[PDB]
Design a protein around this ligand. Structure first.
Ligand SMILES: CCCCCCCCCCCCCCCCCC(=O)OC[C@H](COP(=O)(O)O)OC(=O)CCCCCCCCCCCCCCCCC
Ligand SMILES: CCCCCCCCCCCC[N+](C)(C)[O-]
Lengths: 257, 50, 51, 223, 68, 179, 221, 102, 51, 51, 50
């Protein structure tokens, strides 16, 4: 049948187009994929190739969605993609919070770091630890788990079944992210508090001593010194214990159709 | 249609005038979906930055 | 029935429960057809069932 | 094929979509309350604006997506017939009532009525307003009249809520200061002590969870 | 022009010869009857050839102009 | 081993038993990968290493084109004497009619005139079949009274058949006396 | 040209060429490393993208040229080579191995394996045995499966290289911030002071020489 | 096993027997995958491993086309002596009418 | 069965469990075809099985 | 060694024996890579260095 | 469409001359509605992103 190859190419591009809606938001969140790094002509070419690498159905048979209103569908897929972008981001936002807490305790309120791509305020420590976590995550091969959890998302819940994120856990999400950062930062805050009250108690004997101005000289040195001891566990304490994993897809999403 | 009736009907002017409608309309439909997805993603990025 | 049986998707949506005896299955089939609102046919090789 | 004007309407709508969301949807409220609470805890950039906007966006969809889907299900309906521009206008307007009702629920009647007057009364030689009995106009305020009246009411609600959340943190600040004075450990700035306390206290009570539930329960039942 | 790597004039002389015979004795009915046939066939041959060579040129040109 | 290639080749002017001889004389023949097919016919299968296969298929195609230029329908001239009759046509002017009796040449020629299928038989191997295909309309007969003999031009087979027919026709006539 | 379909295919290829360069050549990597350097120094608009992409494309030419030349002479070659459909399809396929060898030499084995298995489970069904070719000769994988693995591998390694370059400037920034707090000038924006120290540091290193040397030596022995 | 290929072939100048003899002489024949059809007819079904199927199909097609160069409607000549009448047409010169008998 | 067997992609999804004795594979093949809802065929070279 | 080229050449008007003499007179002939074929016919195979 | 399906309209110069106008007027009308709509939404977008 003569026209069959022509139609078979059009089925391919319709499938890729509907996959872009779900893959591109992930490229927006992750720190090594956002347009602060990967921009221009490569960007679309790569996103499309990935989406075709993970689409779940044989590419040469007609797409099933031709009978459906396009907008409700596109919005559905974009929402799903935003949820996945958050869950995959989760290990990086904790280290970023940690760095912001440290740079706030040591003074340093007027930090210099720059970041226009994501539109978020940044400080030198936050930028450093956010980079460092990303390189150890990549070096542990996590990039394979990212495409694994993408493919599983299509097998476990399908665009045509109106797959939807579960509400109850989403209501917990922000507080879990805050909690992990505080639990991890706690050792540096306590020592920086005790160091200040020690100078306060010392000032009782010499009331002209400016204990505040002294503490500003000390605290950045103490903060780096202490963070340098508990540094090495920062490798495993993120590479596994905070990384999302594909078995979690069962609980965060369900099919509503 | 896979090995039923016959192939290669490049040549009869009555069926060749029916193919013109389909070959055009499916190209337009596929072109439209490509824009709608870009618009949607762009709207999400616009809100999240702002 | 001694014949392969082929069911349309719109018939596949319907559910049934209970304990059934398959004797004179043609009669059973034609009765259930009217109770459940199906239509069916037999070309000589297999049985087709539709909503 | 289809109709070439309905195609224009589809493409146009999809360009305006983010401004509608940003100005006529509960996103307006959710995105404000979170950022206020974040400032009150006294430590900006934790959580990120990315986290906050992302969550606010997701929650807004539970409220709004059913209404849009209901409207498209209303229009994809093969049994209608029309005869005239009026008979078509009526049916298209009738399609939007699902959204109109939501805006009417969450906005002020008198500000809506004020703008409903202001669209016309520069035309008018008269003072009487009774001239249409209410039952039509009370149902049919225009959408351009409803939109700004809704946004201006959402903002005010947001401030009302955030006000009550500020109070306990203020109290905590007064307590800390009074203790430092009663100890005479005078020359220490209290903020350094009280910001850790505010953070640990609010996280240990899951303020963000209670907050998220309390916001959604104005608009849905979760069960 | 060859497709790179793909595996896989008498009528002119015949007309010339018949012309030379005829020119020597223009009044011979047998030489006239022969020349009439040779010339008619040669004429048809040249026409069919040149029409075909144009048809192939115009297909190649249409292809290029479609992507150009 | 995964690189093994194979092909089916077909010929029009040469036989597998010919082409083998070419390979042998060349010193290219290889008994591990011999050509497989029918010696009588021009179609064979070959399989082996790339270089070998390519060489074989090239050489066989080009030799077939070279032999395509050679004709082999050798025309044979046969001279046949008639022993029992006169070679020419004759006219007898009856009172009632001008009457004519046609001779052998005229009769046979008129019969074969415009024939297109091969001449098979008379009653009262690819390189062979392509000879047997020769058309019947080419046979030419010229009467030569000087020696009362016919000149016949055709293939060796055709001339033979003509000989048989002539010897079936020129019977000796009886004499009758009317009183 | 001697054949018309051979012409149509050439014009199609020449119409899709730029995306193949944008997604299957080292250009994807050079382009990233230079933007990382500009981020590191804390600059916004200078050097321009057109200047950095200019040098990135020139440098990519030295690396890709030999296999493009090889494919060119391979397809021009005038010696008789094919006869029939199977020989033509094998001749065309054989002509691409010069480039499959390239993609395979730099793609990550784990990603190549993932994209291959996930295609087998599309075509032949998910019950087909998951290969786990842990010790492997990957049997000439399909180029549609091979190409996105290369793209993500180059993104990975370019990010990795870019990380290392930050660490000196990170030091500079935290030091300056500490000495200003030691003087109590809390209201001074450090960036004004730290920007020139970064510039002179990079110039003293001669960064662009070292970096452009090493980036090329990674592709040839 | 899942790679089995199969096809239907139809020839005009060659008999199934002729083709089977070709295969046998070649030493290519395989009794696990024989050709299925009518010896008299030219239409058969074949199924088996790829190499075998492809080879069979190509060989059959080419052999069929080759034989168009052949002709077999051999003309034959017969001599039939009339025992009871003259062969030629006869004219009777009636004094009032010329009559012809074919 | 003494023949190669080919099973379609859509039949391969179904699952079976138990002990089976192969005294008469033809009979067993027919019984299980009717029980599980399959159709099958035999060209003389191989057996083909479909949903 | 990996560069050895080879080709099949055929001539209409000139026999192999006629061509070998040409190469001999020229001083171009090389007994390590001689032509392979039938001296009578005009078709031969040659292989060797590119030049 | 009707003016083309009907055989007495599609074959009389008087009628063809009219159909040519109908087609052109249709083209211009739709093209202008599209243009002005785009310009309109583009103004909103320009102001709100400023
Ligand atoms: C202004 C004039 C109104 C024109 C309406 C005509 C539309 C028509 O009849 O053809 C359908 C046509 C679409 O064609 P279809 O998809 O094939 O049905 O035009 C449209 O694009 C539909 C636009 C109208 C639907 C309004 C829904 C508003 C829901 C509000 C939700 C707001 C937040 C978004 C949540 C995320
Ligand atoms: C997340 C936005 C995209 C998917 C659309 C979700 C529509 C709302 C469905 C809510 C169903 C809630 N429920 C089960 C209590 O009815």
């Amino acid at each position: 049948m003569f026209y069959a190859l022509y139609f078979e190419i059009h089925h391919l591009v319709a499938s890729a187009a509907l996959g872009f809606a779900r893959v591109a938001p992930i490229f927006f969140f992750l720190p090594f994929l956002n347009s602060g790094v990967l921009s221009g002509a490569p960007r679309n070419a790569i996103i499309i190739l990935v989406a075709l690498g993970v689409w779940p159905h044989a590419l040469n048979e007609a797409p099933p969605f031709l009978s459906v209103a396009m907008i409700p569908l596109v919005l559905q897929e974009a929402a799903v993609g935003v949820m996945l972008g958050c869950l995959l981001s989760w290990p990086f936002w904790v280290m970023h919070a940690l760095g912001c807490i440290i740079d706030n305790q040591r003074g340093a309120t007027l930090s210099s770091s720059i970041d226009p791509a994501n539109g978020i305020d940044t400080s030198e420590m936050a930028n450093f630890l956010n980079m460092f976590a990303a390189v150890v995550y990549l070096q542990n091969g996590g990039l394979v788990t990212m495409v694994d959890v993408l493919n599983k998302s299509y097998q476990l819940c399908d665009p045509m079944n109106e797959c939807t994120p579960s509400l109850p856990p989403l209501l917990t999400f922000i507080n879990q992210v805050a909690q992990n950062a505080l639990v991890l930062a706690s050792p540096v805050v306590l020592v920086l508090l005790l160091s200040e009250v020690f100078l306060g108690l010392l000032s009782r004997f010499a009331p002209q001593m400016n204990a505040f101005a002294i503490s500003l000289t000390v605290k950045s040195g103490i903060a780096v010194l202490i963070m340098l001891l508990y540094f090495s566990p920062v490798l495993p304490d993120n590479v596994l214990r905070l990384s999302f994993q594909a078995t979690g897809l069962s609980s965060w999403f369900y099919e509503r159709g | 249609t896979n090995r039923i009736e016959d192939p290669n009907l490049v040549t009869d002017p009555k069926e060749l005038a029916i193919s013109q409608e389909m070959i055009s309309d499916y190209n337009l439909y596929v072109s439209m979906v490509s824009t709608l997805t870009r618009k949607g993603v762009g709207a999400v990025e616009t809100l999240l930055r702002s | 029935l001694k014949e392969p049986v082929i069911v349309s998707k719109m018939a596949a949506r319907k559910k049934i429960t209970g304990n059934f005896e398959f004797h004179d299955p043609n009669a059973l089939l034609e009765k259930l057809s009217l109770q459940l609102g199906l239509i069916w046919y037999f070309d000589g090789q297999a049985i087709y069932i539709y909503d | 094929m289809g109709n070439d004007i309905s195609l224009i309407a589809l493409l146009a709508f999809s360009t305006l979509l983010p401004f509608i969301i940003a100005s006529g949807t509960c996103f307006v409220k959710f995105s404000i309350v979170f950022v206020m609470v974040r400032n009150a805890l006294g430590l900006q950039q934790i959580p990120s604006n990315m986290t906050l906007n992302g969550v606010a966006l997701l929650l807004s969809m539970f409220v709004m997506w059913p209404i849009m889907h209901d409207a498209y299900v209303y229009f994809e309906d093969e049994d209608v017939t029309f005869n005239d521009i009026s008979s078509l206008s009526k049916h298209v307007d009738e399609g939007l009532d699902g959204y109109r009702d939501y805006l009417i629920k969450y906005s002020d009647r008198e500000l809506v009525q004020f703008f409903e007057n202001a669209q016309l009364k520069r035309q008018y030689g008269e003072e009487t307003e009774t001239v249409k009995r209410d039952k039509d106009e009370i149902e049919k305020p225009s959408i351009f009249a409803l939109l700004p009246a809704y946004a201006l009411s959402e903002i005010k609600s947001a401030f009302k809520i955030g006000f009550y959340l500020y109070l306990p943190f203020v109290v905590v600040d007064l307590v800390v200061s009074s203790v430092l004075l009663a100890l005479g450990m005078m020359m220490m700035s209290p903020v350094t002590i009280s910001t850790p306390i505010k953070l640990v206290l609010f996280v240990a009570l899951d303020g963000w969870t209670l907050l998220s539930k309390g916001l959604i329960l104005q608009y849905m039942d979760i069960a | 022009t060859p497709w790179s790597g793909y595996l896989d004039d008498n009528l002119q002389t015949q007309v010339t010869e018949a012309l030379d015979k005829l020119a020597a004795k223009p009044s011979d009915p047998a030489l006239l009857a022969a020349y009439q046939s040779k010339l008619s066939e040669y004429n048809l041959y040249r026409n069919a050839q040149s029409n075909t060579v144009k048809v192939f040129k115009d297909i190649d040109a249409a292809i290029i102009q479609n992507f150009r | 081993a995964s690189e093994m290639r194979n092909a089916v080749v077909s010929l029009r002017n040469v036989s597998l038993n010919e082409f083998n001889n070419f390979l042998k004389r060349s010193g290219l023949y290889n008994k591990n990968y011999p050509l497989r097919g029918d010696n009588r016919k021009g179609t064979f299968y070959v399989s082996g290493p790339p270089v070998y296969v390519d060489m074989v298929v090239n050489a066989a195609t080009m030799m077939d084109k070279q032999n395509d230029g050679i004709e082999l329908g050798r025309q044979k001239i046969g001279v046949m004497r008639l022993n029992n009759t006169f070679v020419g046509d004759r006219t007898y002017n009856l009172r009632d009619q001008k009457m004519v009796i046609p001779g052998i040449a005229t009769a046979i020629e008129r019969l074969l005139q415009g024939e297109e299928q091969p001449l098979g038989n008379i009653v009262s191997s690819l390189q062979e079949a392509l000879k047997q295909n020769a058309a019947a309309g080419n046979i030419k007969i010229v009467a030569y009274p000087d020696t009362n003999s016919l000149l016949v031009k055709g293939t060796a087979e055709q001339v033979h058949f003509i000989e048989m027919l002539v010897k079936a026709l020129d019977v000796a006539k009886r004499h009758v006396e009317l009183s």
